[PDB]
Design a protein around this motif. Structure first.
Motif, PDB file in Angstrom:
ATOM      1  N   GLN A 148       0.862  -1.217   0.000  1.00 51.16           N
ATOM      2  CA  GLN A 148       0.000   0.000   0.000  1.00 51.16           C
ATOM      3  C   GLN A 148       0.886   1.251   0.000  1.00 51.16           C
ATOM      4  O   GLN A 148       0.626   2.158  -0.816  1.00 51.16           O
ATOM      5  N   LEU A 149       1.901   1.279   0.870  1.00 51.71           N
ATOM      6  CA  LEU A 149       2.805   2.444   1.078  1.00 51.71           C
ATOM      7  C   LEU A 149       3.806   2.564  -0.083  1.00 51.71           C
ATOM      8  O   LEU A 149       4.161   3.714  -0.431  1.00 51.71           O
ATOM      9  N   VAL A 150       4.251   1.441  -0.662  1.00 48.92           N
ATOM     10  CA  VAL A 150       5.100   1.435  -1.895  1.00 48.92           C
ATOM     11  C   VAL A 150       4.309   2.082  -3.043  1.00 48.92           C
ATOM     12  O   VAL A 150       4.903   2.893  -3.781  1.00 48.92           O
ATOM     13  N   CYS A 151       3.023   1.743  -3.184  1.00 49.09           N
ATOM     14  CA  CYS A 151       2.104   2.296  -4.219  1.00 49.09           C
ATOM     15  C   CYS A 151       1.801   3.774  -3.940  1.00 49.09           C
ATOM     16  O   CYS A 151       1.571   4.511  -4.917  1.00 49.09           O
ATOM     17  N   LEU A 152       1.779   4.180  -2.664  1.00 49.58           N
ATOM     18  CA  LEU A 152       1.680   5.603  -2.234  1.00 49.58           C
ATOM     19  C   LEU A 152       2.931   6.355  -2.710  1.00 49.58           C
ATOM     20  O   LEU A 152       2.779   7.420  -3.358  1.00 49.58           O
ATOM     21  N   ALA A 153       4.117   5.819  -2.401  1.00 53.90           N
ATOM     22  CA  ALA A 153       5.429   6.394  -2.785  1.00 53.90           C
ATOM     23  C   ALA A 153       5.493   6.575  -4.309  1.00 53.90           C
ATOM     24  O   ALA A 153       5.870   7.681  -4.751  1.00 53.90           O
ATOM     25  N   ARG A 154       5.110   5.542  -5.073  1.00 49.74           N
ATOM     26  CA  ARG A 154       5.018   5.566  -6.562  1.00 49.74           C
ATOM     27  C   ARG A 154       4.225   6.793  -7.027  1.00 49.74           C
ATOM     28  O   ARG A 154       4.703   7.483  -7.948  1.00 49.74           O
ATOM     29  N   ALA A 155       3.056   7.030  -6.424  1.00 45.04           N
ATOM     30  CA  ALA A 155       2.153   8.166  -6.729  1.00 45.04           C
ATOM     31  C   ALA A 155       2.812   9.485  -6.307  1.00 45.04           C
ATOM     32  O   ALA A 155       2.743  10.452  -7.096  1.00 45.04           O
TER      33      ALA A 155
END
Ligand code: ATP
Ligand code: CLR
Ligand code: CLR
Ligand code: CLR
Ligand code: ADP
Ligand code: MG
Ligand code: MG
Length: 1210
Positions: free
Chosen positions: A1115-1122
């Motif tokens: 979830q947080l890796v996908c947040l960082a990506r964004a």
């Protein structure tokens, strides 16, 4: 008693030897194209049930006895394959015997005086010898091909049986790439060894047997010939050793490629949404280039290998004849003997010309043998680690320390607890503290270093990542169990599935999709729960089953199912919860941080402790099918396919290849006739030096022939690489360019088949088939030109002989082609079933359904084999028919020569027989190779299929491209917008009409299955608009190239998707910006501490699609990506689903600070994080209900008020 049994079992002896029983099918196949339905059921001994258990047994007996050798284990197929040796022996003696009779006839016809009776006898003895060698040879070939087939079944059966038992640590080392490669390519490598393994003694025997005739002829001068050939072995030996390294490196590059392709096809939606498919295209090409670069080196060595063997007999011949004159000056000096000696040498090419293919096969098989041996020798997770006592506490863990990998430090540090029977326990803690781990420990998925674990009764499992099969919704809820109408209905209504069963097109029995892509997040999670609840087990391990659904359904499910009043009131149930609403309902709650139980106890007990958790609590408290199966092409292969493969090779190489083939076969015919003209010359005292003059010319042509053979063998190999390279690029681009609807339709194995096996066919097979086809073609032209010009009145014989061969070829191929299509089509389910299994091994193992899935696999492999078996029998059918027609013509040529010995043209007629055998054998070869070519090109036909398909809109329009600073104010306007997922299905959205102004924070709220995720999927234009339009800042969206669109707006999708590679790569696959930018993003993502404390900071190997770390971390890796893209329009699709309440509060504060100026619309179930926003959109089914400021909607006392009251905000 079978309904459509194989005719081979009931076949009489006469039928079995000539393969007369397949006649019936071959005639039926010619009238109307063969179907899957009218293929015979396999023989009892050709079935996975009868083949695989004896192999795995021998592995249990041999592996337990020990290093563990795999070669000794292949005595399973030994007994059956020995008869082959006996058949091969008889055939070789009959091959040796043939020429002898022909010499006696060719001598007999010359001698006028010879009695009438003795002539016929020789022809009768020739015909019988030709018939016997044919029947014996094809009994041999059938044993070899049946052996090969049975090895294919067992290799696939063993690999599948192993895949369900292998450890997690070993699953990381043996990736899906290697497993798919093992079942596909390595089984074909063993099948190809099965033929040529019998030549290892047959070639030396034949070489010795030919050599002995020269000793008998010449004497002790044949030693030099042996000395030249033995000196040759080392070169081929060291070159074979060099190839073995290339084949290993080639296979490693192939595994890495298939592993990457698997990760692409898994998360294609995320590639499509982020507009990343060009980055991943370039990565797949980079791996392909490495694989192809090695394959080129292997092909160079093969050409040198072929070059050596083709020019051996001529070098032997010159080496031999030198020995005579350099010692024997006394006795011997002959002129005619040379011809018989060269006639004896010119057979020594027939064994040596098939050798480099034997060498290639053995090396290729030996690599595959090591790879399969290494895979089957992995550590197996042992189920005796847990006590599993018969149905006093429910589960007891005493000082237990578990670890994901054997050598790594442990995840769970000395956990200690006991749960009584029929007790509702809850598990709470921070993100990535080891909750899902604790449940995995009780299922014996994780290796334990020390301690004692007892789990009393049967276990039912609900995983955090929902796993759903391809079959109908009912069959997912059943999961291979008898249907009870009372209980089934009672579970479905209790799981709150009725409204979901209403909205679905065909109600209950709908094709659910490959990974449940049809359903919404909540629907998937509810089915996954319903299955486990229906199963009715003793202990229940629930990994956050109330996350994706809203407050209304969550409460309903807790009151009707999980809580002490529901279905599971009496069963032991240990659920992992992040919500703090239902903790007063729990018996005991276990808090854990850093893999250690911080403190256990009840709600009140933990409140009285005044601990860390106490302080935490105060702050927060007929049916419509979807997936279309693979379907075979009906008619003849179109010239488009052939022309497409030839277009990829190129004009220059094609004109070079044909030219070298001509040069080779011209030199072949020059040598042929120059010798035959030298034969019939008198031995006068004159022409004493002529022999030593002309034998150098014969040697020179022999070398010239060798040089050209090396030439065209090279030219075709490089041609093959150019073609194979081009075809892959076309296929990959065609796949990556298709829309999302195509991927939701097409099965996974359907694509894995085309990327693995059909491409491996194009790489390896087709070049070899082309070489042998062209060879046979020019051999036939070469024989035809000679006979015609030698006897201008033999022009009448050629057409009739061709016409009847042509009609056999055209009849046979019609059925042969269709069987290869059926087989190639029917192997796709095998891949689909493997792909489906490997994802849900934890679930399969939890419910103990291994036997059912193993039994399913066997039944799916049987279909592929049912299609394969007639194909190889049909090859034998044709071969025996052509050779028997050939024997008949040879008899007539032979009988005509005896009848008309001296009547007329006595000198001419004797030779007529000699090349009547040549043209027959060459026309026999041409038919077989022309058929093999037609069946092999199906692979190219299969790759082409995705050219003429539905394509997504143009990526770069380059004319109506909007400005560099286009999204300048995030003004999103919907105008009468309407979406429709299929063409036939009803609308999910309809008459949407809102104006989201620049820099406006907009909530989206609604009941599960309202069209929230579909609205955001619609904005990015994944699915094209049915009615109305969207407008982003005074610019229409449908017109623009969607890569100009998709780079300018970001989304956090509902499912977090990571790709196999370094953790840095996931955040940024283009490698655009510096490490300081990545570090400040990981600082804002609240992963800095976790990612910094890791052994490899940003070069951490996230494998299997991000299974190395927890869901809440993805979830947080996908947040960082964004956070890295920093666009002006942001779209959150439940970014805070599987996280803490504390962690949620942080990443919200991040979103408030970072995205303060940019337009943000957020879809959410936690209404806590909406009440701060400016406006909120509420939608129920497909239309926007009351909308405005949150405060306003609460004053109205409408729908939003009702949802707020459930959450407990009102
Ligand atoms: N299969 C695995 N292989 C290696 N490491 C793993 C694996 N699963 C989990 N881990 C490691 O263990 C840590 C926590 O384990 P786990 O996934 O059980 O957390 P969790 O409590 O389930 O978290 P969440 O709240 O996100 O569900 C993770 O940070 C991860 O790096
Ligand atoms: C005298 C001639 C006609 C017969 C002997 C030649 C052939 C059969 C011999 C000579 C060199 C041998 C090869 C030497 C090296 C290797 C690589 C090894 O990993 C597998 C076996 C393999 C591939 C051998 C197979 C047999 C072999 C190819
Ligand atoms: C560079 C060189 C080797 C390229 C040669 C390409 C040749 C071999 C290709 C191009 C067109 C092909 C032919 C097209 C049509 C047919 C008829 C079919 O019923 C049997 C195969 C056969 C006879 C094909 C055999 C292979 C073929 C001749
Ligand atoms: C027939 C006699 C007289 C001459 C033979 C010369 C032959 C062996 C030479 C001449 C031209 C050569 C080819 C020229 C171009 C290429 C492309 C290159 O990327 C790989 C090698 C390859 C495919 C060569 C192989 C060897 C070759 C075919
Ligand atoms: N790919 C698809 N094909 C067909 N129907 C779909 C697809 N995805 C979702 N649906 C249907 O559309 C409805 C709304 O889906 P969606 O808007 O994605 O869910 P939610 O609003 O809960 O996020 C669902 O009930 C589902 O059955
Ligand atoms: Mg978890
Ligand atoms: Mg959704």
């Amino acid at each position: 008693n079978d309904p459509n049994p194989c005719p081979e079992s009931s076949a009489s002896f006469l039928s079995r030897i000539t393969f007369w029983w397949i006649t019936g099918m071959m005639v039926q196949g010619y009238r109307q194209p063969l179907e899957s339905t009218d293929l015979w059921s396999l023989n009892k001994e050709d079935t996975s049930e009868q083949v695989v258990p004896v192999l795995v047994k021998n592995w249990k007996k041999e592996c337990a006895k020990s290093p563990s050798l795999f070669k000794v284990l292949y005595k399973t197929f030994g007994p059956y394959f020995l008869m082959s040796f006996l058949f091969k022996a008889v055939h070789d003696l009959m091959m040796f015997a043939g020429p002898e009779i022909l010499k006696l006839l060719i001598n007999f016809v010359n001698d006028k005086k010879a009695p009438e009776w003795q002539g016929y006898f020789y022809t009768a003895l020739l015909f019988i010898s030709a018939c016997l060698q044919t029947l014996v040879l094809h009994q041999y070939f059938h044993i070899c091909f049946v052996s090969g087939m049975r090895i294919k079944t067992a290799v696939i059966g063993a690999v599948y049986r192993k895949a369900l038992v292998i450890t997690n640590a070993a699953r990381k080392s043996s990736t899906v790439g290697e497993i798919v490669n093992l079942m596909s390519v390595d089984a074909q490598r063993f099948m190809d060894l099965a033929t040529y393994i019998n030549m290892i003694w047959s070639a030396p025997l034949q070489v010795i047997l030919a050599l002995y005739l020269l000793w008998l002829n010449l004497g002790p001068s044949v030693l030099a010939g042996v000395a030249v050939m033995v000196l040759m072995v080392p070169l081929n030996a060291v070159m074979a050793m060099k190839t073995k390294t290339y084949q290993v490196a080639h296979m490693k590059s192939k595994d890495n490629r298939i592993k990457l392709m698997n990760e692409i096809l898994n998360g294609i939606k995320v590639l499509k949404l982020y507009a990343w498919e060009l980055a991943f295209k370039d990565k797949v090409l980079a791996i392909r280039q490495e694989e192809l670069k090695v394959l080129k080196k292997s092909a160079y060595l093969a050409a040198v290998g072929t070059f050596t063997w083709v020019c051996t007999p001529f070098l032997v011949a010159l080496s031999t004849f030198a020995v005579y004159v350099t010692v024997d000056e006394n006795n011997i000096l002959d002129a005619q003997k040379a011809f018989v000696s060269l006639a004896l040498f010119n057979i020594l090419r027939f064994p040596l010309n098939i050798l480099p293919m034997v060498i290639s096969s053995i090396v290729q098989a030996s690599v595959s043998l090591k790879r399969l041996r290494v895979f089957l020798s992995h550590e197996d997770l042992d189920p005796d680690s847990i006590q599993r006592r018969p149905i006093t506490n429910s589960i007891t863990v005493k000082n237990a320390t578990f670890t994901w990998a054997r050598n790594d430090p442990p995840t769970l540090h000395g956990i200690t607890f006991s749960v009584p029977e029929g007790s509702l326990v809850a598990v709470v803690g921070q993100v990535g503290c080891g909750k899902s781990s604790l449940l995995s420990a009780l299922l014996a998925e994780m290796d334990k270093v020390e301690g004692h674990v007892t789990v009393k009764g049967s276990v039912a499992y609900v995983p955090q990542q929902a796993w759903i099969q391809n079959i109908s919704l009912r069959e997912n809820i059943l999961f291979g169990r008898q249907l009870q109408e009372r209980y089934y209905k009672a579970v479905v209504e209790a799981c709150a599935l009725l409204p979901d069963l209403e909205i679905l097109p065909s109600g209950d029995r709908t094709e659910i999709g490959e990974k449940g892509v049809n359903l919404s997040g909540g629907q998937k999670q509810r089915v996954s729960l319903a299955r486990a609840v229906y199963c009715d087990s003793d202990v229940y391990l629930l990994d956050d089953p109330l996350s994706a659904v809203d407050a209304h359904v969550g409460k309903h499910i807790f009151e009707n199912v999980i809580g002490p009043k529901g279905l599971l009131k009496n069963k032991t149930r240990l659920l992992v919860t992040h919500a703090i609403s239902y903790l007063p309902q729990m018996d005991v709650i276990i808090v854990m941080s850093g893999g250690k139980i911080s403190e256990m106890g009840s709600y009140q007990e933990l409140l009285a402790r005044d601990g860390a958790f106490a302080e935490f609590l105060r702050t927060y408290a007929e049916t419509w099918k979807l997936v279309e199966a693979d379907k075979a092409q009906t008619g003849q292969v179109k010239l488009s396919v052939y022309w497409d493969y030839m277009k990829a090779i190129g004009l220059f190489i094609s004109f070079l290849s044909i030219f070298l083939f001509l040069c080779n076969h011209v030199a072949s015919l020059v040598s042929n006739y120059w010798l035959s003209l030298w034969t019939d010359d008198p031995i006068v005292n004159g022409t004493q030096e002529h022999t030593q003059v002309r034998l150098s010319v014969y040697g020179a042509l022999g070398i010239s022939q060798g040089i050209t053979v090396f030439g065209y063998s090279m030219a075709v190999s490089i041609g093959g690489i150019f073609a194979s390279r081009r075809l892959h690029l076309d296929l990959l681009h065609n796949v990556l360019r298709s829309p999302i609807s195509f991927f939701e339709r097409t099965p996974s194995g359907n694509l894995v088949n085309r990327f693995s096996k059909e491409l491996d066919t194009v790489d390896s097979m087709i070049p070899q088939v082309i070489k042998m086809f062209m060879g046979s073609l020019f051999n036939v032209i070469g024989a035809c030109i000679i006979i015609l010009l030698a006897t201008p009145m033999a022009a009448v014989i050629i057409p009739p002989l061709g016409l009847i061969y042509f009609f056999v070829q055209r009849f046979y191929v019609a059925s042969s082609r269709q069987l290869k299509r059926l087989e190639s089509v029917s192997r796709s389910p095998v891949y689909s079933h493997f792909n489906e299994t490997l994802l849900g091994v934890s679930v399969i193992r939890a419910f103990e359904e291994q036997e059912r899935f193993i039994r399913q696999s066997d039944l799916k492999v049987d279909e592929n084999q049912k299609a394969y078996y007639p194909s190889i029998v049909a090859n034998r059918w044709l071969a025996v028919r052509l050779e028997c027609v050939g024997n008949c013509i040879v008899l007539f040529a032979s009988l005509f020569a005896v009848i008309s010995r001296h009547s007329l043209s006595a000198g001419l007629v004797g030779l007529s027989v000699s090349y009547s055998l040549q043209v027959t054998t060459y026309l026999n070869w041409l038919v077989r190779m022309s058929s093999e070519m037609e069946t092999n090109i199906v692979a190219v036909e299969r790759l082409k299929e995705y050219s003429e398909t539905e394509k997504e809109a143009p990526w770069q329009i380059q004319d109506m491209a909007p400005p560099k600073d286009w999204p300048q104010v995030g003004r999103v306007e919907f105008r009468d917008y309407g979406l429709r997922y299929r063409e036939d299905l009803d609308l999910v959205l309809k008459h949407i009409n809102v104006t989201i102004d620049g820099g406006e924070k907009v909530g989206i709220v609604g009941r599960t299955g309202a069209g929230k995720s579909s609205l955001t999927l619609g904005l990015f234009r994944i699915k094209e608009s049915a009615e109305g339009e969207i407008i982003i800042d005074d610019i229409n969206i449908a017109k623009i190239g969607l890569h100009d669109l998709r780079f300018k707006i970001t989304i956090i999708p509902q499912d977090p998707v990571l790709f196999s590679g370094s953790l840095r790569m996931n955040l940024d696959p283009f490698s655009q910006y510096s490490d300081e930018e990545v570090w400040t993003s990981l600082e804002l993502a609240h992963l800095k501490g976790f990612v910094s404390a890791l052994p490899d900071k940003l070069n951490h190997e996230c494998a299997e699609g991000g299974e190395n770390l927890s869901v809440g971390q993805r979830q947080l890796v996908c947040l960082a990506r964004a956070l890295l893209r920093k666009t002006k329009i942001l779209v959150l699709d439940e970014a805070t689903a599987a996280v803490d309440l504390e962690t949620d509060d942080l990443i919200q504060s991040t979103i408030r600070t970072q995205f303060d100026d940019c337009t943000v619309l957020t879809i959410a179930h936690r209404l806590n994080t909406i009440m701060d926003y400016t406006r909120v959109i509420v939608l129920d089914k497909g239309e926007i209900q009351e909308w405005g400021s949150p405060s306003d909607l609460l004053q109205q006392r409408g729908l939003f008020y009702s949802m707020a009251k459930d959450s407990g905000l009102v």
